[PDB]
Amino acid sequence: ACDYTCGSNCYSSSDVSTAQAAGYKLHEDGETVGSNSYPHKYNNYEGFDFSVSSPYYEWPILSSGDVYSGGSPGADRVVFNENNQLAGVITQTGASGNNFVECT
Ligand SMILES: Nc1nc2c(ncn2[C@@H]2O[C@H](CO)[C@@H](O)[C@H]2OP(=O)(O)O)c(=O)[nH]1
Secondary structure (H helix, E strand, O other): OOOEEEOOEEEOHHHHHHHHHHHHHHHHOOOOEOOOOEOEEEOOOOOOOOOOOOOEEEEEEOOOOOEOOOOOOOOEEEEEEOOOOEEEEEEOOOOOOOOOEEOO
16 A cells, blocks of 8 residues: 655555665664665654654665665655664655655
């Protein structure tokens, strides 16, 4: 289904799980990909009410269905924690500056 709506992008729960699984694996192997060194810390400056606990890590989710491998990140991110719990799916689309809004 279109479980999450990130601006004009639609993600299924399976899209979110595959993206999360890939970010976590890299987090746990101590490796990073891309210019922005993904997965990195998501600081929660927006102050979202994530049910799960901090430190939070952000990883790009691609609208194409491709899993992120170091290229252009895009607007959308999966946010997970240290226990691989999903905190949320966020996007820079619809937010001003370099801020994020939550995907609905
Ligand atoms: N808006 C925002 N950006 C964060 C936070 N933690 C890390 N960032 C990263 O810092 C940049 C803002 O300078 C954002 O584009 C973002 O990187 P990503 O682009 O890699 O998502 C945070 O909580 N809030």
